[PDB]
Every structure is written in structure tokens, then in C-alpha cells.
Amino acid sequence: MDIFREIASSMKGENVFISPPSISSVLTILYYGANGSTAEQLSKYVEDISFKSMNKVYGRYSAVFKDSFLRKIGDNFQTVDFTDCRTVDAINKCVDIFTEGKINPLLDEPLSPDTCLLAISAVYFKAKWLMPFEKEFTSDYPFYVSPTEMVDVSMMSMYGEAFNHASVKESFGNFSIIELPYVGDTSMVVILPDNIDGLESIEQNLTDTNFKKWCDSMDAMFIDVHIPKFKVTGSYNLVDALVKLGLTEVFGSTGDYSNMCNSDVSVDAMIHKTYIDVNEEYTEAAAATCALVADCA
Amino acid sequence: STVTNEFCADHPFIYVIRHVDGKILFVGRYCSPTTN
């Protein structure tokens, strides 16, 4: 996970949770309206009952758009007045009900009249574990924030069931990998370093290619599982991370989006907000991504 | 070596929510608990 690594590396010590498809779907909107270099840089990111996603594109009513851009976006387009602030409330309310109240509010600042376009993505997930953890076994255990810093966490336990699992030996660290299934066709794969402090070097090699190799090697084995019950919400500005990743002709002035608008527009911000709740009964998650395109008058 | 009888996540770990085929829906890192 390209983007995950960047964000993780730049927030050492911090919990991190992101939804790659949500980010990828906004970048794709931007792609649809970009030309040249900007388009080339972005192309590298153009890509059930448990997972739902939706994209909305809001355009400034006084702007004139390119039909191609609009053709590529489909019935996800809508014209609005960014001037009126009820506009921000209508957008948030929409992201809010689609994410079952988990992402609210996505937009924190009254948008600028300098704004031309908002491409928003929202995704929602909720599913019960194929096999629930029994609350009876949930109890407080020390969690190692660092080798000698212990903090109390509510730990869930499931004894003597079997799960797909693999002991992985790698030049960058050894770890255990397990798959916890959800009712339906999704699962949660967890990567646990053998070294109390070895996550970073493994994190640094978390690649789509590597990740699949590890999954491919898993076999059913009996193993007892203890994992924290947890809730986390994150808010990330993705620009820096994305620039560091090679999207240098995408944000600000140098952004070329003449395949979107007539005027000269620029993308001056890109936020990602997320939420996840892991409990003994189910896992619930949501995320929303927004890129704000401005510069037109 | 690595464990294979017990999966004790009492230290930082990575978790990935994915579709069985293979599409990754969410990726996170658990460094420490939050609030209480």
C-alpha cells in the first residue's frame, strides 16, 4: 500500500487508518479532467452487501464545463452555489447519512468562493465476524506501545478455533499473519511482528505484491486469537504524502485541468477522514475523501 | 521462529480489511489505544 506507507512513515508513533479505494476514486475524478503531465502522474492511480461506495462531484454553477469531463463522471455530477453556506451543510449531511453517521462533518471550513469543483468519495463497511468474540472473554491486558511502556487495553479472545495463518520469515522482519473472516466475502488480515518493536521495517515493505504472497501462503491451523477491541477516527491532509509520491504536477498552480474547465483551475487541498470500530460482534468502517479545485476568478 | 498456536496482538500491528478475491478496502496500523 503505496499511500499507506507514506502517511504511516510521516506520522511515526501514530495510529493510522485509510481507505485506498476512496482516495483512488477521487484521484480518478481529477484524472478525468487533467491534461498532460498532471494526467500522466494521476493515471498511476486509476482503478457486495458489506461494502458500499459513492462519488459525487459538485460544480460551481457559474462555471462552464467540458462535456468529456462530464461524460467520464456520469450521473454523479451536480451544480451548486459554493457561496451559500447551506451548501456545506447539504454536502456533509449527504456524507453523514451515507456513512451512517460515521463521517460527520467531512467539510470543516466554509468553502471559498474561489472554489470551482468538489470531488467527494465516501465508503462504508459493516459486517459481523463469521465467528463473534464472546464478551465473556474480553478483558484488560497490557499493550506494548513500546518495549517498556505498557498501557491497558480491552483485549478480545477467541480460543481453539482454526484460521488461515502463516509464519513469515523475511529479511525485513519475521511476523505472523492471520485472516479473520466476516460473514460474507470479506475478511480482516492482521500482520503481527514477532518482535515487540518490529512493525516499522515490515510496514516499510508492505507491498501489494508482498501482501498477496503472504496471503497465498496461509493455511488453516488451530490458533488462539487475542486482539484489542478498538475505535479510531482519523483525519489526513494527503497533499504532502502524494507529492512525496510523485504527484508534483497535481496540486496548486501547476495543476493542469483544462479537460475539466475552461478557466484556469487548481486543486488546493485533499482531505481523507476515516472511522473504524472493531468489537466482539462486528467491525464497522467508513471513510470519505475530498479534493477541492479552485482558481477561476 | 514466530507464533502459530497463539496470535497475541499486544504490540503494534497492521490490519487490512479486504474482499476475498483480493481488493483492499481499508488498511490501518494499530500503535496504541485511544481515549478510554
From Swiss-Prot, chain A:
The record marks 295-296 as: Reactive bond. Its main location: host cell. It comes from the Viruses. GO terms for cellular component: cytoplasm; extracellular space; host cell cytoplasm. Transmembrane segments: none annotated. Keywords: Host cytoplasm, Host-virus interaction, Inhibition of host caspases by virus, Modulation of host cell apoptosis by virus, Protease inhibitor, Thiol protease inhibitor. InterPro entries: Serpin_CS, Serpin_dom, Serpin_fam, Serpin_sf, Serpin_sf_1, Serpin_sf_2. One of its GO terms (biological process) is symbiont-mediated suppression of host cytoplasmic pattern recognition receptor signaling pathway via inhibition of TBK1 activity. SMART domains: SERPIN (SM00093). The keyword Protease does not apply. The keyword Transcription does not apply. Viral serpin that inhibits both cysteine and serine proteinases involved in the regulation of host inflammatory and apoptosis processes. Major anti-apoptotic protein which inhibits both intrinsic and extrinsic pathways and strongly cleaves host CASP1 and CASP8 but is a rather poor inhibitor of host CASP3. Prevents the proteolytic activity of host interleukin-1-beta converting enzyme (ICE) and ICE-like enzymes. Can also block apoptosis through host tumor necrosis factor (TNF) receptor. Belongs to the serpin family. Poxviruses subfamily. This is Serine proteinase inhibitor 2. It comes from Cowpox virus (strain Brighton Red).
